[PDB]
Symmetry: none
Subunit: 398 residues, 2 copies
């Protein structure tokens, strides 16, 4: 028969020498291997996936044995094999066992493993021929832009409260015009938001960062506040949503770091330190937040000036600074200054003691006095004058 199979440049680009060797090994050893989960959703949406999860009927012991006998190196129910300088993370199909005191049972039933997954658009498998295995209407849901739980929203949320944030993230990722949400899902989120207080800051921060750099971040942050999710994920309860609205417009299209956008919710430095206590963020992330909150009102472009970028250049010359300044320029919506700053090479002071000796000066004190005069001119020019102009200038002084 003829049947529908996926074909695209995004799918084709996955078939590296490693992947071809892996798929041939599993065929040879009579174990089914398929792409699973988020990679499938990405492929169906026309995007090459990264960090693919592969799924198999082989148990972890069978995979170990097979890789061992085939001379294939393993790294790290999941086994990671390395073939042709590429890693492949492969997980045995499983069913969760209900316990009072976490346990799974391996299975070869693809439909049972699909039923374990959260959202219908993430519950699908793809064969390497392009056959789609879809047990929960995920394909139709994806096409209709519906973000829906496998089974009942309340039950799936109460199994892992982080799925509240996943709902938001995938909604941003697939929806075109935001606004339509299933009321049973919103009800489930609002009633169970408090469950997020029991989830690690690390897990939350991973998802929140994806929401912040993803599409429809304005809609989603508003919904997070509107459903009272915000307090349980380390966000201040009384944020300036007006500032967030301005800043989200400012950074749109300019690849903000997640903390850049999050800082528009912070009134004071203490909100960064409170967020850190909850979400356990990296030093770089915290310092970025403090930098923006500290400098957003005062470190601003010069107006009626020869170089509007001069205050920012000063801050950089006087002292990681460039990254922080560029984020600030995004935050402030200074689109016509952002790229200039990204492309600005920090110039050293271009005049040396020797340059002054060459114009006839011999005294150390006099050389230092002249260099100081030249540093001031150089800084005054917005760090733009070069050696000859500066030396020309000093010869006049003399």
């Amino acid at each position: 028969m003829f049947t529908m199979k996926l074909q695209s440049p995004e799918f084709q680009s996955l078939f590296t020498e490693g992947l071809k060797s892996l798929t041939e090994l599993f065929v040879k050893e009579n174990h089914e291997l398929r792409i699973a989960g988020g990679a499938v959703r990405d492929l169906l949406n026309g995007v090459k996936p990264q960090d693919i999860d592969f799924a198999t009927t082989a148990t972890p012991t069978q995979m170990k044995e097979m890789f061992q006998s085939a001379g294939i190196r393993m790294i790290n129910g999941t086994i990671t094999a390395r073939l042709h300088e590429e890693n492949f993370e492969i997980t045995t199909l499983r069913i969760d066992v209900t316990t009072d005191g976490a346990e799974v049972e391996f299975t070869t039933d693809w439909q049972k493993d699909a039923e374990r997954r959260d959202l219908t658009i993430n519950s699908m498998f793809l064969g390497f021929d392009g056959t789609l295995f879809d047990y929960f209407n995920g394909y139709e849901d994806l096409k209709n832009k519906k973000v829906r739980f496998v089974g009942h929203a309340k039950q799936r949320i109460q199994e892992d409260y982080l799925r509240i944030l996943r709902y938001f993230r995938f909604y941003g990722r697939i929806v075109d015009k935001p606004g339509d949400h299933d009321p049973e899902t919103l009800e489930a989120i609002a009633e169970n938001a408090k469950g997020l207080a029991g989830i690690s800051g690390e897990r939350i921060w991973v998802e929140l960062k994806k929401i912040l750099v993803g599409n429809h971040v304005n809609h989603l942050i508003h919904l997070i506040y509107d459903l009272d999710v915000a307090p349980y994920i380390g966000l201040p309860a009384n944020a300036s949503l007006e500032e967030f609205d301005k800043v989200s417009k400012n950074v749109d299209g300019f690849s903000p770091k997640p903390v850049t956008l999050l800082a528009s919710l912070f009134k004071v430095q203490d909100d960064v330190t409170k967020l850190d206590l909850r979400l356990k963020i990296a030093k770089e992330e915290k310092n970025l937040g403090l930098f923006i909150v500290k400098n957003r009102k005062d470190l601003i472009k010069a107006t009626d000036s020869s170089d509007p970028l001069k205050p920012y250049q000063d801050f950089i010359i006087d002292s990681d600074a460039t990254t922080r300044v560029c984020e600030l320029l995004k935050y402030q919506g200074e689109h016509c200054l952002l790229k200039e700053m990204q492309q600005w090479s920090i110039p050293p002071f271009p005049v040396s003691g020797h340059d002054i000796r060459k114009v006839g000066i011999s005294s150390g004190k006099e050389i230092g006095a002249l260099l100081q005069q030249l540093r001031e001119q150089w800084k005054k020019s917005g760090y733009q004058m070069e050696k000859d102009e500066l030396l020309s200038y000093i010869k006049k002084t003399l």
Copy 2:
């Protein structure tokens, strides 16, 4: 009082704007600065020195502060300053600390002199021309004596490369070779094996200086006689008769070091073995191979119209000129060497359009006639010019 100070054109020639600026700086900052080492020996021998070693009581930290404070550029216990388009390498006086390498800075000139190797290299010269000599180096220099500060055995064992230094400086200062201090020869012979622990790069630097310096014949003989040869990458069974002939052949004609060395090599494998030990440059290796391969067969066309022709043919058929000129030096062909060095490689002087003119229009016929002329031109030793070749071909037609 009146005292003896050095005065010569060679000493005066050092006093550039740079050197004057440098000396004034050290006086103003109250640090003694003197010329040291080999530059002093050269000056005492009547020659302007090239890569002068300056010595000072100032520490390296003091010199960096002095130069920075004065806006003077430093380059890369030694500090190098650039003033008035010239570099000056200045080293703080030091003493070596015995360890199971470390030094201590000193302001005692005599202690730094005692660290130096040979008495003729252990002196200092003030910029007024005062000589500071703690180990009889001036007397040894005038008497042509190459003598260690302290005992030869102990100094050689601190740095076995000092064996080659002894040879080098013996060739440099002695006029009639033959008198060697027996304690020094004994120290060399007993410790020659220690050169096996010295890197080939360091050895090759010194060996090259010996090969292009005076009295190379005596020195290579002494290297073999004292059994230093096997430890510095030379073959044990060399043809010293060939060496004697070639050292006489190249004398006065500035041989490259490998040109003279190749006279010790019986076959190409000796070049390859020297290279394994001494890690020589590709051009140095290829010169050795060229000489060994060609010395017997690439020879002048005796009793011919152009004796140089074999060599010219080699160059035309394909660094070849440099290699051939070294071969001519090797071979003692003094009456051919300069002619080759001044020979411009001539292009074949006739083109197809010359054959066309008074031609001949067929491309095929043009190429046949040009071939005939290339042949006459080569036959003539590449000296016939366009007009002579065209007259020749007109006759042929």
